[PDB]
């Protein structure tokens, strides 16, 4: 039974570690989502400023 | 110049109520003696000034963290023409609590569906 119990302990530890892995996976995924939303925001603003600076550069070189 | 404000905004369609979360604020100007102010944020629906919500008073920090939440039981149809007001106040025990800043958010510019959470620069309240 020592063979079996030893293994039992192993499976229990694996269980705990798996639970922790679950929590970590949840935090991971959530923060990944939020960061994705933030990146979307960044690309919106970056395109806005791209247009801004293109138009501004054209207007600036226009008076030359 | 006072500082910025991080807040959260989203709408619960299951209970038909607005969920406004006050996360924190940063780089607030100091108005008190110690070199730091005692800030607290008053939040209320912009359209009608009724049932205004106030956060807990934080002592002597120019970067207060409230992490609080408020619920406005308002239908989704009325919501569109309703604005949100978040004003930062400075607490003083022996005088009028001076307003540090304020911020207004139109609910027609707000997009619900994804949980919103952003930093916005504070401005000086109108006389």
């Amino acid at each position: 039974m020592a063979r079996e119990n030893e293994m039992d302990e192993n499976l229990e530890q694996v269980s705990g570690i798996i639970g922790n892995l679950r929590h970590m996976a949840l935090d991971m995924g959530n923060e990944i989502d939020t960061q994705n939303r933030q990146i979307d925001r960044i690309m919106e603003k970056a395109d806005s400023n791209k247009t801004r600076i293109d138009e501004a550069n054209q207007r600036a070189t226009k008076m030359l | 110049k006072l500082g910025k404000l991080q807040y959260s905004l989203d709408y619960d369609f299951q209970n038909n109520q607005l969920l406004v979360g006050i996360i924190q604020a940063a780089e607030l100007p100091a108005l008190d003696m110690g070199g730091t102010s005692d800030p607290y944020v008053k939040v209320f629906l912009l359209p009608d000034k009724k049932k205004k919500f106030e956060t807990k008073v934080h002592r002597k920090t120019l970067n207060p963290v409230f992490n609080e939440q408020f619920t406005f039981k308002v239908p989704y149809s009325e919501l569109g023409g309703k604005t949100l007001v978040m004003a930062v106040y400075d607490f003083d025990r022996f005088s009028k609590h001076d307003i540090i800043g304020e911020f207004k958010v139109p609910m027609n510019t707000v997009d619900f569906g994804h949980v919103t959470e952003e930093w916005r620069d504070l401005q000086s309240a109108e006389k």
Binding site: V14, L21, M28 | -
Partner: protein, 67 residues
């Protein structure tokens, strides 16, 4: 019990080991992708800061030009 019980035990255990291994590989790939994307973000922030400098100097120049 019998040999059937032990065999099924062994089988389900191996199944668990393989599922575990797939989980592992997923985590490894995760770390990898996140790292590479990290380098990507490095160069992005680089380009952005350069852009900020250029814009600032440009704004100063125009601001001195108009007046």
């Amino acid at each position: 019990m019998a040999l059937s019980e032990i065999e099924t035990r062994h089988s389900e255990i191996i199944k668990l080991e393989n599922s575990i291994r797939e989980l592992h590989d997923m985590f490894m790939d995760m770390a990898m992708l996140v790292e590479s994307q990290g380098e990507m973000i490095d160069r992005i922030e680089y380009n952005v800061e350069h852009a900020v400098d250029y814009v600032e100097r440009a704004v100063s120049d125009t601001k001195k030009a108009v007046k």
